[PDB]
Amino acid sequence: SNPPCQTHETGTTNTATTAT
Amino acid sequence: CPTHADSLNNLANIKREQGNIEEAVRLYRKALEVFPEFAAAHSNLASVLQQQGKLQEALMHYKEAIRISPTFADAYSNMGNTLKEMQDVQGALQCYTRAIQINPAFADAHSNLASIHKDSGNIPEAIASYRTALKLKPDFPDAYCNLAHCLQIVCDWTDYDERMKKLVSIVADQLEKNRLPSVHPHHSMLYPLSHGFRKAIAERHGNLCLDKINVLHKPPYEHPKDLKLSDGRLRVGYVSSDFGNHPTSHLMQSIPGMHNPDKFEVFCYALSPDDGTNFRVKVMAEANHFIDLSQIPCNGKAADRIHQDGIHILVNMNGYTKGARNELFALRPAPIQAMWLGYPGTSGALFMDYIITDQETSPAEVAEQYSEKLAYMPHTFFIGDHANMFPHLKKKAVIDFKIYDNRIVLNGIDLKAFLDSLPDVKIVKMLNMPVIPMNTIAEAVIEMINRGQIQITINGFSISNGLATTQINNKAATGEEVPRTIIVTTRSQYGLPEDAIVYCNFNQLYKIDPSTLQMWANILKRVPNSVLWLLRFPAVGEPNIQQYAQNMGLPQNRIIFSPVAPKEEHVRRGQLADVCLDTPLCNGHTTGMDVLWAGTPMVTMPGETLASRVAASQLTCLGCLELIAKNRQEYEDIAVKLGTDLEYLKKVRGKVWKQRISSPLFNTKQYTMELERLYLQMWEHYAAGNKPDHMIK
Ligand SMILES: CC(=O)N[C@@H]1[C@@H](O)[C@H](O)[C@@H](CO)S[C@@H]1OP(=O)(O)OP(=O)(O)OC[C@H]1O[C@@H](n2ccc(=O)[nH]c2=O)[C@H](O)[C@@H]1O
């Protein structure tokens, strides 16, 4: 197996929708 | 009214960007009150709800937006982000790909999809998706900064200098405009950012926790101000998602059981479920109280539980890493809260009072790097359970294929007993070293390795191939149990040369930058018969390292790559190296302890960040100041002297082999005692009615 390491979740980008 | 609802939704978007999430939620809800079938408002509301930790309520509104508008790509992509946070990888994937299917030019969806590939270990696919996102939207901080980390992981250094410039420029612009930086607080240690920038990045990530607990509207907790309720004992709570098979437990699993029960009551709060390993078993059994907070996902109720136990000192072992629930610390269920061991840096957050470190790791002249007050351990804050986990490596013997201490090595609990049956064994003074001559027994052992046999039996003793530990005992390979057999480890197992100096580094490749490889190249050039030993960590980084080394004048055969190994083999095979070359950008931490337990000298050059100073702290505690460089020239000179002056190498290697036992570095009993003295200083200070201050003794 790959050894367990110190891990961090990658941030994602929320999309804000402008109303027209 | 169209205009009315539209204005409410758009103003709420503005409030969201400003960091006023409460007002955003308010405006989104008024928009939906005016116009119930408002798809954009449903999706936008779900986003701020997600940011508030209300994930299930977010999903409901995302689905409502999509029911109203089936081709609403933003809603799919945003919903994917929520599912990803919920650890629903497949669900997140299906949302991202649907969003991209609706709109192939949707840059955000490509970048979000990339994060799934990144966290799955599919770096090439992550890179490709991030590049698609940046092709569609060139100004995209999230995509660029995560792409940069992807490139760091595989050691792609194409335009590295301009990459660093862009990263710093991005962080500066984001901090100025009060945004959450696109650079993760852990990753920030890898880039030439200021200490002020790094601490600010951390601070803003800590602010995310405040957004999640503010909606709970819980009042501040009343804290104990004496030890009366606990019969004079101090109640310490260790909070970690890593009680199980994780480097954290490999370091501190013995510590809860070694606390003095006359003065301390140990509470362990697990943020993860039982993984069925001996690591988890040991902590559950030896802690006075073990609490599975993974059964209590509501942060309000979890913090309530901690408070009901009457915890005096709550210890944060996660920082900004996976499985963390720093919302618990933001609620302050304890009067004293400390960062310890797990996270190599500042929290940047006000809800953390102390960071447990040491004078070597965190000198007072760089104290502005941390938001917490400094709390000094007398030697090093670092610790490992190596003496308990791998005692079979306390002693070793070699086979003389003719004398080397690291070409053909045997280790074992019953090694001494086995050697008693071999009357032709010579004891060479270097504790000294037993040497098996090239006899019948030695030839049988060597035949086993050459033929890839699993194990043989000699005089009743089981002799194991070091490459085959998992086939013999899974628990022994993971470090869950001590190996019972005599294990054989050879340079031939890894394609290492028999008559040359081996410099090693067993860290993930991300810790290597161009400057480090250049420094390593200078060393290899000055030591004719020497190779560099690295890991396929990951394998796709290998051709990159090889290319850059060739460009630096190093032939390809000078660098030897091995696969990552099970825990036990990884520590054990460190014995085959002559010297470890530590990474200055970010030191080996756990891997630093791993190599020193094998008796291998480590050369290091401490920087300014915590992460770049840990190895020097370990070596200072070990008692080998001569292995700590003050600059790059000295780093190279030390390494070259070790590789060319063979008597000096023998002296230094013997020093490490002895002092790993005699120094306090791997002494968990002594560590626990001194940690207890520090806890008491923290308590008395608080109990005297004082706000936290530097406990630098
Ligand atoms: C910079 C940073 O994140 N520092 C953290 C520290 O601050 C924390 O205090 C340490 C405990 O939480 S974790 C971390 O410490 P690091 O030294 O970076 O290790 P990292 O997270 O890459 O893991 C590699 C593992 O694989 C094992 N390993 C390695 C090679 C191998 O072939 N086999 C193997 O089992 C090794 O034994 C390791 O167990």
Short mmCIF file of N, CA and C in Angstrom, two decimals, chain B residues 405-407 409 489 491 496 500-506 531 533 572-581 595 598-601 649 653:
data_model
loop_
_atom_site.label_atom_id
_atom_site.label_comp_id
_atom_site.label_asym_id
_atom_site.label_seq_id
_atom_site.Cartn_x
_atom_site.Cartn_y
_atom_site.Cartn_z
N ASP B 405 29.18 -2.04 7.45
CA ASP B 405 28.11 -2.11 8.43
C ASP B 405 26.72 -2.00 7.79
N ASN B 406 26.67 -1.89 6.47
CA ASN B 406 25.41 -1.56 5.80
C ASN B 406 25.23 -2.13 4.39
N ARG B 407 25.84 -3.28 4.13
CA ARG B 407 25.70 -3.93 2.82
C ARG B 407 24.75 -5.12 2.91
N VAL B 409 22.59 -6.78 6.07
CA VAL B 409 22.26 -6.58 7.47
C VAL B 409 21.22 -7.59 7.97
N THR B 489 18.29 -7.72 5.25
CA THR B 489 18.18 -6.52 4.43
C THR B 489 19.51 -6.28 3.71
N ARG B 491 21.71 -4.33 0.19
CA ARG B 491 21.74 -3.29 -0.82
C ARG B 491 21.32 -3.82 -2.19
N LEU B 496 21.25 -0.93 -4.92
CA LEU B 496 22.26 -0.01 -4.43
C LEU B 496 23.65 -0.61 -4.65
N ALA B 500 30.05 1.91 -2.85
CA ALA B 500 29.91 3.36 -2.98
C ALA B 500 29.08 3.95 -1.85
N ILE B 501 29.25 5.25 -1.62
CA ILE B 501 28.50 5.97 -0.61
C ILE B 501 27.04 6.15 -1.04
N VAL B 502 26.12 5.82 -0.15
CA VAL B 502 24.71 6.02 -0.43
C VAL B 502 24.14 7.17 0.40
N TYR B 503 23.77 8.25 -0.28
CA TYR B 503 23.03 9.34 0.34
C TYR B 503 21.54 9.10 0.11
N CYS B 504 20.74 9.21 1.16
CA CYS B 504 19.31 8.92 1.03
C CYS B 504 18.42 10.09 1.42
N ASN B 505 17.20 10.06 0.90
CA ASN B 505 16.11 10.88 1.40
C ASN B 505 14.79 10.20 1.07
N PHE B 506 14.01 9.91 2.11
CA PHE B 506 12.83 9.07 1.97
C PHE B 506 11.53 9.86 2.09
N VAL B 531 25.96 7.63 -4.69
CA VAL B 531 24.67 7.73 -5.35
C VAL B 531 23.65 8.39 -4.43
N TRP B 533 19.71 8.16 -3.14
CA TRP B 533 18.66 7.16 -3.00
C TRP B 533 17.35 7.85 -2.65
N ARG B 572 13.58 0.01 8.50
CA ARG B 572 14.68 -0.95 8.45
C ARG B 572 15.70 -0.70 7.33
N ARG B 573 15.23 -0.43 6.12
CA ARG B 573 16.14 -0.27 4.98
C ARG B 573 16.96 1.02 5.05
N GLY B 574 16.62 1.90 5.98
CA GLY B 574 17.43 3.08 6.24
C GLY B 574 18.83 2.70 6.71
N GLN B 575 18.98 1.49 7.24
CA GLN B 575 20.28 1.00 7.68
C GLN B 575 21.26 0.82 6.53
N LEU B 576 20.74 0.69 5.31
CA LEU B 576 21.59 0.45 4.14
C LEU B 576 22.30 1.71 3.65
N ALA B 577 21.78 2.87 4.02
CA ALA B 577 22.37 4.13 3.60
C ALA B 577 23.56 4.50 4.47
N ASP B 578 24.41 5.39 3.96
CA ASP B 578 25.51 5.92 4.75
C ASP B 578 25.11 7.21 5.44
N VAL B 579 24.47 8.10 4.69
CA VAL B 579 24.08 9.41 5.19
C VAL B 579 22.71 9.79 4.62
N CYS B 580 21.87 10.43 5.44
CA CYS B 580 20.63 11.01 4.95
C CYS B 580 20.83 12.51 4.69
N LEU B 581 20.39 12.97 3.53
CA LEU B 581 20.42 14.39 3.21
C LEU B 581 19.02 14.96 3.40
N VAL B 595 14.77 7.72 10.09
CA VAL B 595 16.13 7.51 9.62
C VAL B 595 17.13 7.45 10.78
N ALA B 598 17.33 4.16 12.54
CA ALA B 598 18.12 3.18 11.79
C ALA B 598 19.63 3.38 12.01
N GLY B 599 20.00 4.43 12.73
CA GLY B 599 21.39 4.72 13.01
C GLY B 599 22.09 5.47 11.89
N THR B 600 21.31 6.14 11.05
CA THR B 600 21.87 6.85 9.91
C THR B 600 21.99 8.35 10.17
N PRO B 601 23.20 8.90 10.03
CA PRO B 601 23.41 10.34 10.21
C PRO B 601 22.58 11.14 9.22
N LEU B 649 33.13 9.02 9.06
CA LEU B 649 31.79 8.46 8.83
C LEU B 649 31.50 7.37 9.85
N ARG B 653 28.45 7.62 12.46
CA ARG B 653 27.44 6.56 12.41
C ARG B 653 27.35 5.82 13.74
#
